[PDB]
Amino acid sequence: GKLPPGPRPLPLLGNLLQMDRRGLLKSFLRFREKYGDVFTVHLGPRPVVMLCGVEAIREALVDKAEAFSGRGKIAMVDPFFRGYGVIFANGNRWKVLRRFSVTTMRDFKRSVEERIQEEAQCLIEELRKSKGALMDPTFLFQSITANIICSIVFGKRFHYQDQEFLKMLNLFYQTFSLISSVFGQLFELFSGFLKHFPGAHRQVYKNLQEINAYIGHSVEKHRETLDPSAPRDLIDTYLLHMEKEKSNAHSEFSHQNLNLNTLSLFFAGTETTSTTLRYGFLLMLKYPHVAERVYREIEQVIGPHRPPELHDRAKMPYTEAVIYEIQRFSDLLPMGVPHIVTQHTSFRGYIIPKDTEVFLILSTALHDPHYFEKPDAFNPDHFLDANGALKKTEAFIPFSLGKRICLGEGIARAELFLFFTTILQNFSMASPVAPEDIDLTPQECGVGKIPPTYQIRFLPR
Ligand code: HEM
Ligand SMILES: OC[C@H]1O[C@H](O[C@H]2[C@H](O)[C@@H](O)[C@H](OCCCCCC3CCCCC3)O[C@@H]2CO)[C@H](O)[C@@H](O)[C@@H]1O
Ligand SMILES: CC1=CC[C@H]2[C@@H](C1)C2(C)C
């Protein structure tokens, strides 16, 4: 009959005065205590329905896909993306851009696996050259994941010591942080007001323009050398489609979709997997007995030299459990990416009007103590049975579900496994901080959950 229950709002401020100072997620976990798994919070001027736990989330994204499949905005980046590109598009643009992006990622020329394998070898050579010196591995982790996207999109990889590559990686890093910051969460509530003032939203806008400028230039160099009978990469393929549909003024294959879809694939392609890697190696420093056990399995299944391959996974249940647990623990996007309802819909008795924003709080499925005993601790046994065999679970939804499910899922799982195991096959880790002193508390927790900076050494075996 009405919207899910929640804290009683004030006219201008919504539920501001009921929020927790520590962020949106914390705010929402407190409301969930009081209201249950389906509730409404007024984020500044508008109601947003929160869905918590695997059942409710899957009931919405899978059983009710006809309605929960729209994409909402992220205040901090809407001014840039404006509903262009696969992540932020709706309706028929999304359908075109999704089919195109899914279809030209898989089809191309090396397999996905081969490209990751080569990149893993370049990574190992790089880590060798560093001769056990301390670094903050953020740049390398962004470099190897960026290079996978790059070879699909630009037809090329960049070298780790290229200062122009590094400068773009810095912008991806700064932006993800700024977006996930306390100001970014405030902005989600009050963009309407805050936009008129200086603040992080302008820096994010400017960073994204700067990345936009490289992509515009690359599109140009491609157009100039384009061979219709032999498209090199995803940009070439988009250009061909642009040609084919030029007589339709309403073609989705526009120039803004070109730039912003590409940029969307890049952002998501780089920052998601690299952040998981960052948390992953920090977790390894804090739990060296886990890293040592992963290494014993690599030794026994793969050996000290033969490059790891995807077909190794099924024979490495421990390593897979550690990687699942890294993802579960990391909780990359704790509230997922905003959805909206596309038509009036009933959900557990409530009525959700059309164009009502919905957050699926993926963090609540990942921390569900019915599936994961002691869900706030890192523990790979979360994903092992009695016999040490891999135990997958329905609650494991860090890619979300349904029509909008991460389209990069397969690529990211390939990268996490090949980069994790290839590094561990060749190196052990050390740092100047004892495992008991290692603090896992995120540096940011908003849209994204971002681990603190740290120094690590990679020691050759
Ligand atoms: C650890 C790595 C990753 C995680 C945890 C992750 C997670 C997610 C999540 C939660 C969503 C939101 C789905 C929803 O709207 O309900 C998403 C969407 C998306 N992701 Fe991933 N992602 C990862 C890696 C990647 C990679 C490597 C790519 C590209 C190569 C990618 C590309 C995308 C795109 C294009 C969307 C939007 C899909 C759509 O709206 O139709 N992601 N991702
Ligand atoms: O397009 C106009 C702009 O061009 C110049 O910037 C160059 C720089 O001179 C040049 O150093 C830079 O090189 C960047 C190469 C690395 C790009 C790698 C990433 C790009 C996309 C996401 C993944 C990979 O590209 C920029 C864009 O062409 C000028 O310096 C700018 O001031 C100007 O506004
Ligand atoms: C896959 C992710 C989608 C939404 C968040 C991160 C990448 C971006 C695009 C800011």
Side-chain angles (χ1 to χ4, degrees), residues 146 149-150 154 156 158 162-163 165-169 172 210-218 262-263 266-267 270:
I149 299 300
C150 288
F154 301 126
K156 63 163 287 178
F158 290 90
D162 178 348
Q163 288 282 309
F165 188 47
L166 292 192
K167 177 185 216 79
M168 295 298 101
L169 297 184
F172 278 119
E210 222 175 301
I211 301 163
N212 202 19
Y214 175 87
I215 280 160
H217 181 274
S218 164
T262 292
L263 188 14
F266 271 116
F267 192 93
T270 299

Side-chain angles (χ1 to χ4, degrees), residues 131-163 165-273:
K131 292 280 162 88
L134 288 162
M135 56 182 81
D136 174 316
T138 295
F139 83 95
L140 279 170
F141 291 158
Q142 296 178 283
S143 283
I144 66 190
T145 61
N147 273 337
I148 307 313
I149 299 300
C150 288
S151 78
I152 297 162
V153 165
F154 301 126
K156 63 163 287 178
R157 66 180 294 273
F158 290 90
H159 287 63
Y160 305 145
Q161 80 176 69
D162 178 348
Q163 288 282 309
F165 188 47
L166 292 192
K167 177 185 216 79
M168 295 298 101
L169 297 184
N170 180 72
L171 290 170
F172 278 119
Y173 171 75
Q174 302 306 333
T175 302
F176 199 34
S177 292
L178 283 179
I179 282 167
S180 299
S181 67
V182 166
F183 182 93
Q185 301 170 57
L186 197 42
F187 203 72
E188 189 62 41
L189 277 34
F190 294 121
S191 56
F193 175 88
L194 288 159
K195 69 183 178 143
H196 300 295
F197 299 89
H201 51 299
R202 285 165 183 196
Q203 179 71 46
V204 158
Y205 185 87
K206 196 152 134 26
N207 296 355
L208 293 159
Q209 264 298 106
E210 222 175 301
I211 301 163
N212 202 19
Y214 175 87
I215 280 160
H217 181 274
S218 164
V219 161
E220 196 43 47
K221 296 182 44 168
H222 273 74
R223 203 203 52 71
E224 287 159 25
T225 59
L226 177 67
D227 171 335
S229 48
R232 285 158 295 190
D233 56 26
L234 183 144
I235 286 163
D236 275 1
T237 303
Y238 190 105
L239 288 172
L240 300 172
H241 282 93
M242 171 179 308
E243 247 309 316
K244 181 169 101 200
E245 302 197 354
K246 63 183 192 144
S247 88
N248 176 6
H250 272 262
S251 166
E252 286 306 346
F253 292 95
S254 56
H255 278 285
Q256 279 177 114
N257 270 332
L258 184 44
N259 288 37
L260 304 188
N261 193 69
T262 292
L263 188 14
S264 286
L265 295 171
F266 271 116
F267 192 93
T270 299
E271 288 306 296
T272 52
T273 310

Side-chain angles (χ1 to χ4, degrees), residues 371-373 375-405:
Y371 296 91
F372 314 107
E373 186 58 55
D376 298 331
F378 178 74
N379 192 31
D381 296 338
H382 286 143
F383 290 90
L384 296 171
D385 65 29
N387 315 318
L390 186 60
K391 186 173 105 220
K392 294 156 139 166
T393 166
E394 250 198 320
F396 181 74
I397 61 172
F399 298 109
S400 178
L401 300 158
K403 281 210 197 340
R404 288 295 176 142
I405 185 164

Side-chain angles (χ1 to χ4, degrees), residues 71 74 77 81 87-88 175-176 179-180 208 263-264 267-272 332-333 336-338 406-407 447-448:
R71 165 70 62 229
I74 287 179
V77 299
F81 287 94
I87 302 171
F88 300 110
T175 302
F176 199 34
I179 282 167
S180 299
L208 293 159
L263 188 14
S264 286
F267 192 93
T270 299
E271 288 306 296
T272 52
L332 181 61
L333 307 170
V337 176
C406 165
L407 67 78
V447 174

